[PDB]
Amino acid sequence: AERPTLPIPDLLTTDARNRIQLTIGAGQSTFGGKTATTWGYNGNLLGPAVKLQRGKAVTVDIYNQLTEETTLHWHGLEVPGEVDGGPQGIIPPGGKRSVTLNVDQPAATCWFHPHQHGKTGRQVAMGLAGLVVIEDDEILKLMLPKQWGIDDVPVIVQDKKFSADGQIDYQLDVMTAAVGWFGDTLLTNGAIYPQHAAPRGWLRLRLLNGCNARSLNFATSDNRPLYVIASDGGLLPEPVKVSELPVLMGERFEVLVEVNDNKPFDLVTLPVSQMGMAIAPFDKPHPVMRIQPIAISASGALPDTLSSLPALPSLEGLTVRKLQLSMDPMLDMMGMQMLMEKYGDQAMAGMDHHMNHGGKFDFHHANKINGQAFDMNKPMFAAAKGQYERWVISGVGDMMLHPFHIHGTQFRILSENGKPPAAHRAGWKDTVKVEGNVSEVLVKFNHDAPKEHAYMAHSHLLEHQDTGMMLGFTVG
Ligand SMILES: [Cu+2]
Ligand SMILES: [Cu+2]
Ligand SMILES: [Cu+2]
Ligand SMILES: [O]
Ligand SMILES: [O]
Numbered sequence: 001a002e003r004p005t006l007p008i009p010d011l012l013t014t015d016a017r018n019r020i021q022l023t024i025g026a027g028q029s030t031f032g033g034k035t036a037t038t039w040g041y042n043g044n045l046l047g048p049a050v051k052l053q054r055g056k057a058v059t060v061d062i063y064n065q066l067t068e069e070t071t072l073h074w075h076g077l078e079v080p081g082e083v084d085g086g087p088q089g090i091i092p093p094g095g096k097r098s099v100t101l102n103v104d105q106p107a108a109t110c111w112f113h114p115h116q117h118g119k120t121g122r123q124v125a126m127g128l129a130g131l132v133v134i135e136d137d138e139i140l141k142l143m144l145p146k147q148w149g150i151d152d153v154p155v156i157v158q159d160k161k162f163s164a165d166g167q168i169d170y171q172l173d174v175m176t177a178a179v180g181w182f183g184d185t186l187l188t189n190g191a192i193y194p195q196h197a198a199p200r201g202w203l204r205l206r207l208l209n210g211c212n213a214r215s216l217n218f219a220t221s222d223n224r225p226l227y228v229i230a231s232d233g234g235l236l237p238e239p240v241k242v243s244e245l246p247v248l249m250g251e252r253f254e255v256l257v258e259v260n261d262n263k264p265f266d267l268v269t270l271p272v273s274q275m276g277m278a279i280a281p282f283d284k285p286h287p288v289m290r291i292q293p294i295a296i297s298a299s300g301a302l303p304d305t306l307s308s309l310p311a312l313p314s315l316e317g318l319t320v321r322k323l324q325l326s327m328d329p330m331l332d333m334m335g336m337q338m339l340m341e342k343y344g345d346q347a348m349a350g351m352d353h354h355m356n357h358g359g360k361f362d363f364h365h366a367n368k369i370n371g372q373a374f375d376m377n378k379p380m381f382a383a384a385k386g387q388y389e390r391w392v393i394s395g396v397g398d399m400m401l402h403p404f405h406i407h408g409t410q411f412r413i414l415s416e417n418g419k420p421p422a423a424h425r426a427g428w429k430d431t432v433k434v435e436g437n438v439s440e441v442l443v444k445f446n447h448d449a450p451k452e453h454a455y456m457a458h459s460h461l462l463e464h465q466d467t468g469m470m471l472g473f474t475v476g
Helices: 120-125 137-141 174-179 329-348 462-466
Strands: 019-031 034-041 049-053 057-064 073-075 096-102 108-113 130-135 152-160 185-188 195-209 216-220 226-231 234-242 245-247 252-259 265-269 286-297 320-326 381-383 388-394 402-406 412-415 431-434 438-444 455-459 470-475
Touching (some): 108 120, 108 195, 108 252, 120 462, 152 286, 174 462, 185 286, 195 245, 216 226, 245 252, 320 402, 388 402, 388 431, 402 438
Parallel strands (some): 049 130, 152 195, 195 286, 320 388, 381 470
Antiparallel strands (some): 073 108, 108 130, 152 185, 195 252, 216 265, 226 234, 226 252, 265 286, 388 438, 402 431, 402 455, 412 438, 455 470
16 A cells, blocks of 8 residues: 555635635545545645735635635735635635635745634634735845645645544644644644655755644754745745754745655654643654655756845834733633543643633633634724834743734744744744743734724634634734
8 A cells, every 4th residue: 555645735826817816625535544624725625725816906706605604814914804714704605706816926825714703623623724925026046945735745634633533623722722732643734654756966945834833843863954935924935954844833935855766765753842742652652644756857056146135124113012822711721621531631741841600711712812702793903004013922931832923914023932042033924932031022013903894913822712712813
């Protein structure tokens, strides 16, 4: 039994009406020989890669064929609130919604996923996610690996867990509200440990951590390096060689890796220091995909310089915003308890050395920002348009992982959890790590967001987002 080949999302561009059609629906998938109900865009699971060009507009027709409400958000894409597809961007079951995307940012790998109010974790777990490939005139000139599905390949990495009958086992409950939804099964573009045949020379991997709650850390099985060429919001100024690459939920990195004849190697993910995430089989390096070299030459390049990264401006005078994240200590303790009871000491491996009391104690609004669980009816503030602000995000008070994502922007990290960002994280980012400490980012919003269609700012640990760790804000 050979490994299955890596599934490759179709690369989708506009029709003569300048339209892209996306259908959201339920179908079936097979995992380890057992059928499961799954959801996808234009298919049963996951989704296509929407190709966009800077300075060109496209219209997307979104047909919701689910029997429940959903929304469609373009994570990493800088668009006005009205088409951002946050929780206010409801698409009724059996209905259609169209959005016009006016792309105005550099080449990047972004993605799209649902943002249904309090149910985002389930709708992603069930299968919904797709990709966005933005191109511009600058990137084409670099002559990067660019044959889609051959030497330029998307790698969407996600865990799931399943019940004995084969269905996806998703429950938003006290334990998962506390530590997140995670599983024992790793998927790569929906497949379990596929192989990808790649030509000899450079292979470009567009990595996405599409897990609800699990952080990842990519490496190769034989320790060849990864050359990071881009982050959430696009190219770095020059490649950054790494031996390992931590990737938070919702983050993307693009890397080049060498392919040499006769020497297959795996892309792997290394055990992380996050509660619950080092339970078997994740207590050891876990393969993601096998790269199978093909004795045909790859023509892409790894250029010395990629792009121009502007200077950080002066900070004095800029609006400082305070975002204090918090969790309910009682509900945090209870969830952590159930975790430890279920899996034992292994649920903290790698870490550093029952009655109804009513609505007030409901875990569904246990997580908050600035003492408020997400309130769709009330944006927490009005941010400035076209002006840099400094947003200060604190996780002091608990030790959970909060990958913080701000909609409507690509920002620069000034401090990541109390340290200046690593070089490959110093460019354009839409996510910043917050874990027991404080982060600060420099952000600018180029588009309007009104009260009725606010931008979200939230943890991308989906179960925390769904139970309150999110705020709305307006721009302009
Ligand atoms: Cu987003
Ligand atoms: Cu997102
Ligand atoms: Cu979001
Ligand atoms: O997002
Ligand atoms: O998100």
